[PDB]
Design a protein around this ligand. Structure first.
Ligand SMILES: O=c1cc[nH]c(=O)[nH]1
Ligand code: SF4
Length: 207
């Protein structure tokens, strides 16, 4: 598949890239979503962070990581002494994939297929080309697999500094737990997992 490639313009300007993502039809996810959600921040960023996809909040705000997972993430960044205004924050897939359940308090996100990730990956390539980050934080399974391969296991490479040639700039790559995984479950387990997120964020910051 060609995917998003036909829709990515020959430019490194983020505002231009964001606009053209708004017209992307490189998989079927544009149809039900409200709008594309491009990355936030600037091309001076040293650290890029990539999540899975916009959720419910993000689909309507037009910005990444503005819901509960994003508030958790801010708490982690803060403890790692990282200013979020200095990052470029984005997602592997740029349109919200979702459903609704009866009695639901919100739209429930559905995991992008590997095919959708590969379809949308040209946007990530363009973002990386535009920003030239020194390090990329891969937030959770989908984002990590997008760069590291569909077989990659986030849980097994926590806190490791990774590199593949496959990527623009040969930044270091640090794969970590998705902040939404820390929202729920037993208290000791959340707190432990949170401490590891802070650690992995510091690994990325010290590259
Ligand atoms: O931006 C976001 C928000 C929630 N979950 C993600 O993966 N990315
Ligand atoms: S999800 Fe990515 S590839 Fe699919 S339509 Fe939206 S922007 Fe294009």
């Amino acid at each position: 598949m060609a995917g998003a490639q036909d829709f990515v313009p020959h430019t490194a300007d983020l505002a231009e890239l964001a606009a053209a993502a708004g017209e992307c039809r490189g998989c079927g996810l544009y149809r039900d979503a409200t709008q594309a959600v491009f990355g936030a921040g600037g091309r001076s960023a040293r650290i890029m962070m990539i999540g899975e996809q916009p959720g419910d909040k993000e689909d309507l705000a037009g910005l990444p990581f503005v819901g509960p997972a994003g508030r958790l993430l801010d708490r982690a960044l803060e403890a790692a002494d990282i200013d979020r205004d200095a990052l470029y924050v984005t997602n592997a897939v740029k349109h919200f994939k979702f459903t609704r359940a009866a009695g639901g308090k919100r739209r429930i996100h559905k995991t992008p297929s590997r095919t959708e990730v590969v379809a949308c990956r040209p946007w990530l390539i363009a973002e990386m080309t535009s920003v030239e980050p020194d390090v990329v934080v891969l937030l959770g399974a989908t984002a990590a697999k997008a760069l590291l391969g569909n077989d990659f296991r986030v849980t097994q490479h926590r806190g490791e500094v990774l590199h593949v040639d496959d990527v623009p700039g040969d930044p270091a790559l640090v794969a970590t737990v998705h902040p939404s995984s820390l929202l729920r479950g037993p208290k000791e387990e959340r707190e432990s997992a949170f401490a590891g997120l802070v650690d992995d964020l510091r690994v990325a910051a010290d590259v």
